[PDB]
Amino acid sequence: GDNSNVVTMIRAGSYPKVNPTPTWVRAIPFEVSVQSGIAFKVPVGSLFSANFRTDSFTSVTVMSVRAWTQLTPPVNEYSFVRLKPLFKTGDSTEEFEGRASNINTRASVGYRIPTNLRQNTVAADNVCEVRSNCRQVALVISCCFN
Amino acid sequence: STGDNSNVVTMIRAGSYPKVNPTPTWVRAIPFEVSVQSGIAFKVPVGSLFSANFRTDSFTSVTVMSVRAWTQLTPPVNEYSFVRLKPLFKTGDSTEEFEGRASNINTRASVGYRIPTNLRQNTVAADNVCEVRSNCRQVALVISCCFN
Amino acid sequence: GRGKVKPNRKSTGDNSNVVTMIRAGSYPKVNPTPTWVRAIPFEVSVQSGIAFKVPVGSLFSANFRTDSFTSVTVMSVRAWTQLTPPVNEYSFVRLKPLFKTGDSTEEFEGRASNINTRASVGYRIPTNLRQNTVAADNVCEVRSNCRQVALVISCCFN
Amino acid sequence: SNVVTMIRAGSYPKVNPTPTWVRAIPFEVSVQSGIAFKVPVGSLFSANFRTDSFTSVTVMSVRAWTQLTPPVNEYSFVRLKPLFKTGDSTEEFEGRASNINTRASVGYRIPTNLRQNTVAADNVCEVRSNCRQVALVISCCFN
Amino acid sequence: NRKSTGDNSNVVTMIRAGSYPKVNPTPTWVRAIPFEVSVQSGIAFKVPVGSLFSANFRTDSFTSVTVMSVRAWTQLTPPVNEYSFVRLKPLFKTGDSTEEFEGRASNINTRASVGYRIPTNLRQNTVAADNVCEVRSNCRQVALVISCCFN
Amino acid sequence: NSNVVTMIRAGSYPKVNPTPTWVRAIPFEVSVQSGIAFKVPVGSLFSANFRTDSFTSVTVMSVRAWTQLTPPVNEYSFVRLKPLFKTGDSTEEFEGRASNINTRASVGYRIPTNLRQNTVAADNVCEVRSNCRQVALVISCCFN
Amino acid sequence: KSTGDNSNVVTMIRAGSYPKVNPTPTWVRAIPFEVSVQSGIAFKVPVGSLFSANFRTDSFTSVTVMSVRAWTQLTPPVNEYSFVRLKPLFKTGDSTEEFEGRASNINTRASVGYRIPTNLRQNTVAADNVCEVRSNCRQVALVISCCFN
Amino acid sequence: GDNSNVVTMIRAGSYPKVNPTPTWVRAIPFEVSVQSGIAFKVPVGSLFSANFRTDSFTSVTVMSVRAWTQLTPPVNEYSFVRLKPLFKTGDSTEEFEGRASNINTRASVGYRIPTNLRQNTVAADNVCEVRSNCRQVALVISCCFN
Ligand SMILES: [Br-]
Ligand SMILES: [Br-]
Ligand SMILES: [Br-]
Ligand SMILES: [Br-]
Ligand SMILES: [Br-]
Ligand SMILES: [Br-]
Ligand SMILES: [Br-]
Ligand SMILES: [Br-]
Ligand SMILES: [Br-]
Ligand SMILES: [Br-]
Ligand SMILES: [Br-]
Ligand SMILES: [Br-]
Ligand SMILES: [Br-]
Ligand SMILES: [Br-]
Ligand SMILES: [Br-]
Ligand SMILES: [Br-]
Ligand SMILES: [Br-]
Ligand SMILES: [Br-]
Ligand SMILES: [Br-]
Ligand SMILES: [Br-]
Ligand SMILES: [Br-]
Ligand SMILES: [Br-]
Ligand SMILES: [Br-]
Ligand SMILES: [Br-]
Ligand SMILES: [Br-]
Ligand SMILES: [Br-]
Ligand SMILES: [Br-]
Ligand SMILES: [Br-]
Ligand SMILES: [Br-]
Ligand SMILES: [Br-]
Ligand SMILES: [Br-]
Ligand SMILES: [Br-]
Ligand SMILES: [Br-]
Ligand SMILES: [Br-]
Ligand SMILES: [Br-]
Ligand SMILES: [Br-]
Ligand SMILES: [Br-]
Ligand SMILES: [Br-]
Ligand SMILES: [Br-]
Ligand SMILES: [Br-]
Ligand SMILES: [Br-]
Ligand SMILES: [Br-]
Ligand SMILES: [Br-]
Ligand SMILES: [Br-]
Ligand SMILES: [Br-]
Ligand SMILES: [Br-]
Ligand SMILES: [Br-]
Ligand SMILES: [Br-]
Ligand SMILES: [Br-]
Ligand SMILES: [Br-]
Ligand SMILES: [Br-]
Ligand SMILES: [Br-]
Ligand SMILES: [Br-]
Ligand SMILES: [Br-]
Ligand SMILES: [Br-]
Ligand SMILES: [Br-]
Ligand SMILES: [Br-]
Ligand SMILES: [Br-]
Ligand SMILES: [Br-]
Ligand SMILES: [Br-]
Ligand SMILES: [Br-]
Ligand SMILES: [Br-]
Ligand SMILES: [Br-]
Ligand SMILES: [Br-]
Ligand SMILES: [Br-]
Ligand SMILES: [Br-]
Ligand SMILES: [Br-]
Ligand SMILES: [Br-]
Ligand SMILES: [Br-]
Ligand SMILES: [Br-]
Ligand SMILES: [Br-]
Ligand SMILES: [Br-]
Ligand SMILES: [Br-]
Ligand SMILES: [Br-]
Ligand SMILES: [Br-]
Ligand SMILES: [Mg+2]
Ligand SMILES: [Mg+2]
Ligand SMILES: [Mg+2]
């Protein structure tokens, strides 16, 4: 085992349980555009794409959302980014926020979804609202594609 | 059961932007069948492992680790099922004929072969995994592999 | 009844202050051209939106003392952005492995969190994919919003 | 692991495109009967050894073997007289064979306090032998 | 070191001196000498050993020095869009080297630093007319700190 | 130990000081006449002969004295030291005598920490007395 | 048996193959010799003084000096105590140290010495100098520890 | 303490006992020419030479003698060498002998001198007699020059 130099025989038995289309836990990176003073609803459909090897999925269970400002903030200001989670059974009002302490540095923050709120979404659903003084925010969403 | 968390969304104290990879690898084992004729060896093409039916249509290369085969249909009359595998390599084919036979005419014949580490390079669709032989008109394969 | 051969001022272990005699025996196995494990630093030019294939021929050069070699087994690749990024942006750098037996579709990426700082990333090659390459071969594709990328490749010249 | 992996690289490290490299250089020299031959350090800088990029080298120890057969009725012998730029030696480290068909061999170590750089124009040692060729193996540090 | 916990004498005390000792009015001195050198683009600058002998370092009484290690820092800002870098090539009277110890800054606003240690077998004296090393950089000045033994 | 140069992974520019302090033992001689005390000037400690011409101030810790020349005929050597200070001169006469006429006389005195302040070339360290015409001093001090 | 090792007659040595030899080996020595010194003038001790048949070292051409010790060889001036100074000399750069030793008895020698560090122990030839010697005495006795090669 | 890089001061004391011409223990290698069947008398004067750095000596105390055949033997023969110790108070009749088991290989033999016979010998003296079917013999004599 891990020590041979040639092919060896496998004494296979019965035909096992199979599944050609299994689930997949992923940390999907992508960016969204953000206007000043306006909240942007992140579509779940942005997680289904051939750029991520996920165009074969139609449902996803989101587990946590992390955000980073992707461009520089306005003059004289430090970057900030806010996140309001959204849920189909009822949206929240939390505004998890992070700010940069160095004007040249990104702002970041995230939120975890409790187990009791980890159901499936589809491309028409929205994950959360994003607010920032920077015109583009980079998101890394950890989720289970099924 | 105690070992849980909370019932509400919590805040994550994220740090710097991490290293990312939108197109990662995937250790998989693909199930698919191949048609085989009597007295004729069928070369299993690697392209069979790339398909939307397997969520692998974004990959172009794969590293095969082990191959297993079952007879998918019944054997001829009066006969028991058998299946054979001959590993094929771009750097040099083999001449091993890993064979399994059933001891019950109603039962599948099965066999497999592991690939050693020193022979675990990438293969593309134009390549072949192995030759298959059998007295049955179809063989079912399950190929453990690493897509990249 | 052995005794006395020659006096070479050998004091303690380390060290001695004069030349000493070595009791050489049979001629040993030798190799005038041995292998050499190295970490080669070099830069490449990159256009925005276009991938650049890093030629393995850049590793063989008199600037690295690697000019007698014709092959090289690459182990890992590391990349840093060598110039500043576009205005309002943070630096990023991507790497896609390339192999003669089959190119990969990974895009290992690293970004800067400070606009004044390099973006960095790398990837290790598994032992089962560590064969030799020649100058006509390519190591990996590189992408970046910066016009230059600094590469440091860990390899075994042979 | 059978597949590539991502390295979480940090800041650009300290690099050196032209390191030093420690070696054991093998090469032969031609020796005349009764005459001493000064081994040049330039024999160590050659593409035949991959060391052509260097111009200096610190020699650590010298080892010699007769490369051809000795004269009729004789046994092989080889001598070594170290040579330094600050002051040549008068030692004659000699080795003799006990079988006429076997090589003669000898070597000498250079002490730490005499391990400075040498250039191609300098000389390592003098070789004396009754055989027309001697095989040298010099352990040194190219820099 | 005496008592260390007992230094209480508030007045002069007598010293029972014996025989005249060995003396040396001009001893050695281990130092880390900081000084800068001007560098041009695409050109190596040979650092002269004479810069180590100066009244600005209390060392103008010396004429020889044994260098132990060299450390360099970029002293001015680098060109536009570039990260600072500096290279050192050791020089020796018995034979110049070809090593180019290089350090690069990862933040354009930060210095680039690198250094190299000399081994014991290469620690001999150097005089003003000698050179320490070659310095290469994209910045017009390089701050050096040379650890040495003035003797 | 290694036989070739090695790389140092330097970091941020350190704190530096091109003109540091120096703890020293300075040996010099003074001329002394019979029946009269010689005031040792602190300026004698600042000289290129000692590698201390760059200094203008020094903190003295202890003073040791030896007779440098032979004594008068029939006499044993003796040397005396009376400390001096800018805040208050002392009246101690630390004295040592030779028990062999062919041997030096020696003596010294330590300065307490509470009296270890700087002095300049103007100041004087101590008064020296001896029946010999020259005295050899070895003053331990801190240059700054 | 029979008096363990105390053999009273010749015995046979079962020699083997020929060993590595050297008719001209190195010799670590403490070489004593005197030098002539003037008043207020430094004398450069030549390395050639170490090569001589008086020391059995005339067959050597180089030598690695390890340390230098000096003693005044004659009496000092009237009223004075003996003293001797040593300033090391090196081919790569001369030292400015003046290691000094004085006598505390006028009838006794003054003495001092200095050690050379390993990194400065290279070979010297007859044209080289070891150090400068200063003294109020007119002759100084030296004992130089060195390795002949 | 140990790793000094600069010259350090030695606190020398009284002038020590000195000796410009000390003794020297040595292993002197030299060859002698021999005839067939004839015993050759090895002279002690062959140990005093500038080629051995010992021309300043005039006496030497020999401790042990070892001999190797320096040239090849006659055809059909294995090399041999004999040693007979010679002493100023009475020569010996011992013939310590060694023969080669390979015609291409040297023969060798030696003898140790007992402490009670280790007196000085001058140039005119003789160490031993040598007998060999080879025309040269290589001697290595461990002695104490004084
Ligand atoms: Br095997
Ligand atoms: Br098998
Ligand atoms: Br199963
Ligand atoms: Br998974
Ligand atoms: Br992932
Ligand atoms: Br896909
Ligand atoms: Br805004
Ligand atoms: Br809760
Ligand atoms: Br990370
Ligand atoms: Br990954
Ligand atoms: Br996986
Ligand atoms: Br699977
Ligand atoms: Br068929
Ligand atoms: Br049937
Ligand atoms: Br078959
Ligand atoms: Br069939
Ligand atoms: Br030897
Ligand atoms: Br030694
Ligand atoms: Br070997
Ligand atoms: Br090798
Ligand atoms: Br290596
Ligand atoms: Br390297
Ligand atoms: Br390139
Ligand atoms: Br492997
Ligand atoms: Br771009
Ligand atoms: Br990592
Ligand atoms: Br790294
Ligand atoms: Br790193
Ligand atoms: Br580093
Ligand atoms: Br390096
Ligand atoms: Br090396
Ligand atoms: Br080598
Ligand atoms: Br010869
Ligand atoms: Br080369
Ligand atoms: Br010779
Ligand atoms: Br020469
Ligand atoms: Br010859
Ligand atoms: Br001192
Ligand atoms: Br110091
Ligand atoms: Br300092
Ligand atoms: Br310029
Ligand atoms: Br000064
Ligand atoms: Br000064
Ligand atoms: Br080394
Ligand atoms: Br370091
Ligand atoms: Br600091
Ligand atoms: Br300081
Ligand atoms: Br100090
Ligand atoms: Br005065
Ligand atoms: Br008085
Ligand atoms: Br004054
Ligand atoms: Br000064
Ligand atoms: Br105080
Ligand atoms: Br008086
Ligand atoms: Br007996
Ligand atoms: Br016997
Ligand atoms: Br010796
Ligand atoms: Br002289
Ligand atoms: Br004087
Ligand atoms: Br003078
Ligand atoms: Br002589
Ligand atoms: Br005299
Ligand atoms: Br007396
Ligand atoms: Br008297
Ligand atoms: Br050393
Ligand atoms: Br005088
Ligand atoms: Br030191
Ligand atoms: Br003696
Ligand atoms: Br003859
Ligand atoms: Br004959
Ligand atoms: Br006979
Ligand atoms: Br006798
Ligand atoms: Br006895
Ligand atoms: Br006789
Ligand atoms: Br015969
Ligand atoms: Mg930002
Ligand atoms: Mg005297
Ligand atoms: Mg023979």
Question: Exposure string (b/e) for H9-43, b if CB count within 10 Å is 16 or more?
Answer: bbebeebeeeeeeeebebbbbbebebeeeeebebe
State the Cα–Cα distance between residues H95 and H80, nearest whole angstrom.
12
Say if residues E19 and F104 touch (Cβ distance below 8 Å): yes
Residue B130: C-alpha distances to residues B111, B114, E45 (Å): 13, 12, 64
* Dist. CA F51 → ligand 77 center (Å): 28
Give, as one character, the DSSP assignment of residue G105: B
Ligand nearest, relative to CA of residue C17: 18
Minimum CA–CA partner of C95 in chain B: B21
State the Cα–Cα distance between residues F115 and F86, nearest whole angstrom.
10
Q: Are B17 and C111 in contact (CB < 8 Å)?
A: yes
Beta strands in chain E (DSSP E): 13-15, 29-38, 45-48, 65-74, 85-90, 101-104, 113-117, 125-126, 131-137, 141-150
Say if residues C21 and D93 touch (Cβ distance below 8 Å): yes
State the Cα–Cα distance between residues F44 and F135, nearest whole angstrom.
14
Task: Read off the amino acid at residue A42.
Answer: V
Assign residue G136 a region (left: φ > 0; alpha: ψ between -120 and 50; beta: otherwise): alpha
Minimum CA–CA partner of C93 in chain D: D9
- Return the CATH superfamily for domain G3-149: Satellite virus coat domain (2.60.120.220)
Say if residues F53 and E58 touch (Cβ distance below 8 Å): no
Give, as one character, the DSSP assignment of residue E139: S
SS3 D24: strand
State the Cα–Cα distance between residues B43 and C53, nearest whole angstrom.
34
CA atoms within 13 A on the CB side of B94: 24
CA atoms within 13 A on the CB side of G97: 29
Residue G101: C-alpha distances to residues B43, D143, G39, G115 (Å): 96, 44, 17, 15
SS3 E4: coil
CA-based nearest residue to B85, from A11, F37, C138, F116: A11
What distance in Å separates residue C29's CA from the closest CA in chain H?
Answer: 25
Cα torsion angle, A126, A127, A131, A135, sign: negative
Task: Read off the amino acid at residue F21.
Answer: T
Domain C12-158 in CATH 2.60.120.220? The answer is yes
Query: Regarding beta strands E125-126 and F22-31, do their DSSP bridges make them parallel or antiparallel, or are they unpaired?
Result: unpaired
Give the Cβ contact number of residue A85 at 10 Å: 22
Task: Read off the amino acid at residue B120.
Answer: R
Q: Are G56 and H53 in contact (CB < 8 Å)?
A: yes
State the Cα–Cα distance between residues H79 and H131, nearest whole angstrom.
11
Domain F1-144, architecture per CATH: Sandwich (2.60)
Minimum CA–CA partner of E105 in chain F: F11
Minimum CA–CA partner of H5 in chain D: D113
Q: Does H138 touch chain D (CB under 8 A)?
A: yes
Give the Cβ contact number of residue E64 at 10 Å: 23
F3, two tokens: 């036989």
Chains G and F touch, contact meaning at least 3 pairs of CB atoms under 8 angstroms apart: yes
State the Cα–Cα distance between residues E149 and H88, nearest whole angstrom.
62
State the Cα–Cα distance between residues A22 and G118, nearest whole angstrom.
71
Chains H and C touch, contact meaning at least 3 pairs of CB atoms under 8 angstroms apart: yes
Query: Regarding beta strands B128-134 and C36-45, do their DSSP bridges make them parallel or antiparallel, or are they unpaired?
Result: unpaired
Residue C6: C-alpha distances to residues C9, C21, D78, D94, G28 (Å): 10, 9, 17, 11, 14
Phi, psi angles (nearest 5°) of residue B65: -110, -45
- What are the sequence ranges of the domains in chain A? 1-146
Q: Are D3 and C126 in contact (CB < 8 Å)?
A: yes
Give the Cβ contact number of residue C135 at 10 Å: 14
* Dist. CA E119 → ligand 44 center (Å): 9
- In chain G, DSSP finds a helix count (H) and a strand count (E) of 0, 10
Q: Are G11 and C17 in contact (CB < 8 Å)?
A: no
Say if residues G83 and G146 touch (Cβ distance below 8 Å): no
F73, two tokens: 């005929």
SS3 B48: helix
How many residues would you count in chain A? 146
Residues of H in contact with D98 (CB under 8 A): 68, 105-106
State the Cα–Cα distance between residues C38 and C156, nearest whole angstrom.
6
SS3 F35: coil
Residue G112: C-alpha distances to residues A8, G90, H16 (Å): 81, 19, 13
Beta bridge partners of C45: C148
Q: Is B86 exposed, middle or buried (0-12, 13-18, 19+ CB in 10 A)?
A: buried
State the Cα–Cα distance between residues E140 and E84, nearest whole angstrom.
11
What distance in Å separates residue C1's CA from the closest CA in chain A?
Answer: 53
State the Cα–Cα distance between residues H50 and G61, nearest whole angstrom.
13
State the Cα–Cα distance between residues C8 and C19, nearest whole angstrom.
7
Ligand nearest, relative to CA of residue G141: 62
What distance in Å separates residue H36's CA from the closest CA in chain G?
Answer: 22
State the Cα–Cα distance between residues B61 and C101, nearest whole angstrom.
9
Q: Does C152 touch chain D (CB under 8 A)?
A: yes
Beta bridge partners of H69: H137
Beta bridge partners of E23: G100
Residues of D in contact with F12 (CB under 8 A): none
Beta bridge partners of C109: B20, C94
From the candidate CATH numbers 3.30.1200.10, 2.60.120.220, 3.20.20.100, 1.10.357.10, the one assigned to the domain spanning A1-146:
2.60.120.220
E31, two tokens: 């130092």
State the Cα–Cα distance between residues H103 and D99, nearest whole angstrom.
9
Dump the DSSP string for C78-122. Answer: EEEE-B---TTB--EEEEEE--TT------EEEE-SBTTB--EEE
From the candidate CATH numbers 3.40.50.1220, 2.60.120.220, 2.60.40.10, 3.40.50.920, the one assigned to the domain spanning E5-151:
2.60.120.220
List subunits contacting chain A, requiring 3 or more Cβ pairs under 8 Å.
Answer: B, C
Residues 6+ apart with CB under 8 A from E5: none
Q: Does B98 touch chain A (CB under 8 A)?
A: yes
Query: Regarding beta strands B98-101 and B82-87, do their DSSP bridges make them parallel or antiparallel, or are they unpaired?
Result: antiparallel
Query: Regarding beta strands B42-45 and C132-133, do their DSSP bridges make them parallel or antiparallel, or are they unpaired?
Result: unpaired
Residues 6+ apart with CB under 8 A from C49: none
Q: What is the dihedral of CA G20, G23, G25, G30, to 10 degrees?
A: 150
Residues of B in contact with A117 (CB under 8 A): 9
Beta bridge partners of F62: F110, F140
Provide the experimental method for this PDB entry.
Answer: X-ray
- In chain A, DSSP finds a helix count (H) and a strand count (E) of 0, 9
Say if residues B145 and B64 touch (Cβ distance below 8 Å): yes
How many contacts, defined by CB atoms under 8 Å, are there between G and H?
Answer: 137
State the Cα–Cα distance between residues D9 and E44, nearest whole angstrom.
31
List subunits contacting chain G, requiring 3 or more Cβ pairs under 8 Å.
Answer: C, D, E, F, H
Say if residues B145 and B130 touch (Cβ distance below 8 Å): no
Q: Does D55 touch chain E (CB under 8 A)?
A: yes
Domain D1-143 in CATH 2.60.120.220? The answer is yes
Report the CATH fold assignment for B2-148.
Jelly Rolls (2.60.120)
Cα first-last separation, chain H: 37
Residues of B in contact with D6 (CB under 8 A): 19, 21
Minimum CA–CA partner of A64 in chain B: B12
Residue E100: C-alpha distances to residues C76, C155, D15, E133 (Å): 23, 20, 8, 10
Say if residues A60 and A141 touch (Cβ distance below 8 Å): no
Say if residues F81 and F65 touch (Cβ distance below 8 Å): yes
Among the partner-chain residues D74, D94, D101, the one whose CB lies closest to the CB of H71 is D74
CA-based nearest residue to E31, from E67, E61, E64, E63: E67
Q: Does C99 touch chain B (CB under 8 A)?
A: yes
What distance in Å separates residue E114's CA from the closest CA in chain D?
Answer: 7
Among the partner-chain residues E22, E24, E66, the one whose CB lies closest to the CB of H5 is E66
Q: Which residues surround ligand 14, an ion (CB under 5 A)?
A: B 77-78
State the Cα–Cα distance between residues H91 and A14, nearest whole angstrom.
98
